[PDB]
Design a protein around this ligand. Sequence first.
Ligand SMILES: Cc1cc2nc3c(=O)[nH]c(=O)nc-3n(C[C@H](O)[C@H](O)[C@H](O)COP(=O)(O)OP(=O)(O)OC[C@H]3O[C@@H](n4cnc5c(N)ncnc54)[C@H](O)[C@@H]3O)c2cc1C
Ligand SMILES: [Cl-]
Length: 496
Amino acid sequence: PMLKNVVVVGGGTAGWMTASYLTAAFGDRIGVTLVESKRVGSIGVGEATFSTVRHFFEYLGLEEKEWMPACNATYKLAIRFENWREPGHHFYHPFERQRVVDGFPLTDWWLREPRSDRFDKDCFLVGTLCDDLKSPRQLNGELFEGGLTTQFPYAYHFDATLVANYLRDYAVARGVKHVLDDVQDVALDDRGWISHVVTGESGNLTGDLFIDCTGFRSLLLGKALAEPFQSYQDSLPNDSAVALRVPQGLRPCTTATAQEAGWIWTIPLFDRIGTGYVYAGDYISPEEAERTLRAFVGPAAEHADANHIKMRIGRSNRHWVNNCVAVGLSSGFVEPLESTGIFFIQHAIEQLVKHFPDERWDDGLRTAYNKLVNNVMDGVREFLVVHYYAAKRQDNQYWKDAKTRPLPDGLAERLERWQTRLPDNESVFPHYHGFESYSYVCMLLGLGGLDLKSSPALGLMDAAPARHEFKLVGEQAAELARTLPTQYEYFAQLHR
Ligand SMILES: Cc1cc2nc3c(=O)[nH]c(=O)nc-3n(C[C@H](O)[C@H](O)[C@H](O)COP(=O)(O)OP(=O)(O)OC[C@H]3O[C@@H](n4cnc5c(N)ncnc54)[C@H](O)[C@@H]3O)c2cc1C
Ligand SMILES: [Cl-]
């Protein structure tokens, strides 16, 4: 007794990732309909991704060389953090797993005896590749790792509208019914379950399962079903953004430049730059934020229209209620400091397939699904609070307040453990939330606000293997700088 029809409401990145993934997972064995407005646009942002996104394209059977040119896409090997510790300081948060020497990470050996003033230069390859604007692939397509299960779980930058167009064509070609219309009413039955959605001129769209991809407005879950929403704003005050699209070497990383009341993203696409100021409206006005952003970008922004966005920061109490699942901004959101919006969508849809119901609608599937999503969002929220707490700067009220806001449960205890020994698998938020322990280590070392200590055991061990590893990183960096093409060179002859 299996379900027969899914209705997806919304045609942004969330809706078309949902629809395309459903056809990849279930084929023609279930019907999928997507309805989307002709007049309400998508949010217009969401252009950097997280490590897991490679597996989304793999699941659909899409190779980089076919979708990347069609989506204005580049590689994201890291995030470059600027001015978080102090003025003029920068460091990389790379998609690069730790090197472990005799049971201890190289970063631990570094902390014992720093080889330079840059932990990321000494311990990692990827930051240097970003500085040299390198492609992660040689001109013959082979990944650089093969010349040294991957140590480099990288991601992408792309135009979210082009990706959504690409997945729409992917999904419609595989039988997804596409309705271009407004949902004007969500009809509930006597159980409070969704019976159908009423469209302006396409009749009623009926189905067994309804996916709310309507964005922040959450027309099905938050509005029609009145599901409570849990704000994160007390712990993360950034509630606003102003975004620009700007004409444009391609640095394979996102840049996050701390500002007086937030931070500015720089996302390099193949032929343009996406940039925006994420800020706290209680500290600066939208006018000041736009002024700051335009001055930061410089003359290239003098003719670009600013896109002002109010963010709904938090998560729904439940994400799957009755026969309705929220995917995308309707489900939850944190500021894009670590590029988690599309990660949340992929997690939501992957776990919806894994917990997909039959006609018995086992409530335990909902309970498990909701716990998984809540744990992912709570964990990312904790990770982001650490960004502001561990940022060394306390130069104004905003950056002082970043250390006195209420911490999520358990973070105070974890902060104390991290100042005893660097974070590892057993000293971070103990549920899946995307980020691995190496991300915590890098952020703490770069942000520089905590009192970090190396493990005393290192003093009783042979330092030779660690010294060899540091030397090896330098040799491999030198070889990669000589051989890898620049990212522009790579895409220039790939766009042939
Ligand atoms: C400033 C900012 C920066 C971000 N940066 C990143 C980033 O770097 N990386 C990342 O991964 N994510 C990022 N995100 C998150 C990202 O934008 C979302 O995860 C993603 O775009 C999915 O959005 P959505 O589809 O849920 O909502 P939307 O894009 O708002 O889509 C809503 C859809 O519902 C439709 N709709 C609405 N009402 C109706 C109706 N009545 N009837 C029919 N259809 C309707 C609309 O037409 C639209 O198609 C960012 C978000 C913001 C605000
Ligand atoms: Cl995000």
